[PDB]
Amino acid sequence: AYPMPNPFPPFRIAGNLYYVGTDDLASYLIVTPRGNILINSDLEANVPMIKASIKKLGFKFSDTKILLISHAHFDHAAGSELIKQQTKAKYMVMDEDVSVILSGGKSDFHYANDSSTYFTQSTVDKVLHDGERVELGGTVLTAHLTPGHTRGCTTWTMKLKDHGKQYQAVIIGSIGVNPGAKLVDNITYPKIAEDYKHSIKVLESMRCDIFLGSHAGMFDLKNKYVLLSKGQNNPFVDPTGCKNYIEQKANDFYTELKKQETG
Ligand SMILES: [Cl-]
Ligand SMILES: [Zn+2]
Ligand SMILES: [Zn+2]
């Protein structure tokens, strides 16, 4: 059973990007004059928490115009149908992950036969592609296809202005290798290893100032939030941590590949 995340205080990360997630599953709110964009619906049990966080910041849940996700796995997309019903937000997903979203996880190349990983089925209002942009009220998000973890895992990026300076925010979708995933001669997802390697190439050459991810633990949410409360110069601007994390996971992939190929 996936550990139920604990509530986390919502806050502004930089520019018009706010954190409205939990102490684990990370969710983001981009506020614009023409509505807001929400990233990651998390677990069903988390929807009320996400709505509450958005309202705590002084915004309206009803102003959610677009719903996005890091990748198609229950812990990041299970609550999407509820959010669509409750806000009428337009659901946009990377083409490669659409099948999983429509089938509620039944078509998952790895978890197709694990009902504990299934989630409510939902329709995709707009199919996204590598490098496509999502724009609203002047804000521009770019969807980067960084496959492997899921066929259509998306790494979202955007430029934020903070304290007069410009910073590239990167929400790493995930390039982690889940326990059991087969990297060699995968029957259902043959290009899995090839995809991970492509993601490593993309991520390792990607400008990254404001380091974020689908999971709080990826970018040290807790400690950075504490520094933020202490009033430190945006502790979320962490290009060094981003570089190191990407390299670490890139190496974690090769460690698993090595294990599967020679262990
Ligand atoms: Cl990790
Ligand atoms: Zn996942
Ligand atoms: Zn996850």
Q: For residue 64, which of 75, 51, 76, 48 has the smallest C-alpha distance?
A: 51
Distance of CA 206 to the CA centre of its chain: 16
Q: Which residue has the tokens 């504990």?
A: 116
> What is the Å distance from ligand 3's center to 75 Cα?
6
Characterize 191-219 residue by residue with b for buried, 16 or more Cβ atoms within 10 angstroms of its Cβ, and e for exposed: ebbebbbebbebbeebebbbbbbbbbebb
| Number of domains the chain contains | 1
Distance of CA 205 to the CA centre of its chain: 19
Minimum-distance ligand to the CA of 217? 1
> What is the Å distance from ligand 3's center to 33 Cα?
31
User: Got the DSSP string for 117-159?
Assistant: G-------SEEE-TT-EEEETTEEEEEEE--SSSTT-EEEEEE
User: Range of 84's domain?
Assistant: 1-263
Contacting residues for 221 by C-beta, under 8 A, at least 6 apart: 8, 19, 23, 26
Q: Where residue 212 sits, what CATH number does that domain have?
A: 3.60.15.10
Minimum-distance ligand to the CA of 248? 1
